[PDB]
């Protein structure tokens, strides 16, 4: 479908661009356990 | 001696007080630096586009 030319008389195939994409990383909230508490002793002075 | 046991207990108040009030400033400033890279974020990608 050219010219005389040679040149193309149809317009060209023509290509919308990818959009970049929005980076995304992995969140994550802090896990752990508390601590038990050690044994128990009464001890040499008095509570106050 | 009761006064000197409540000015103690006061004292640590006093303690907790000052901790707090800086863990809530501290807080609220990590806060912030998150706000404002979550938007350095959304910004780059206009400028990219």
Not at chain 2, 2 to 11: N, Q
Request: no cysteine; aromatic share 4%.
């Amino acid at each position: 479908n050219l010219s005389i030319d040679g040149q193309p008389l149809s317009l060209p195939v023509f290509a919308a661009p990818a959009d970049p994409a929005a980076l995304l990383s992995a969140a994550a909230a802090a896990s752990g356990g508390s601590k038990p508490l050690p044994s128990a002793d009464i001890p040499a002075m008095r509570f106050p | 001696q009761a006064l000197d046991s409540a000015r103690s207990l006061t004292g640590q108040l006093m303690q907790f007080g000052s901790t707090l009030l800086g863990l809530i400033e501290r807080r609220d400033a990590e806060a912030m630096s998150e706000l404002l890279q979550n938007q350095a974020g959304e910004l780059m990608l206009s400028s990219l586009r």
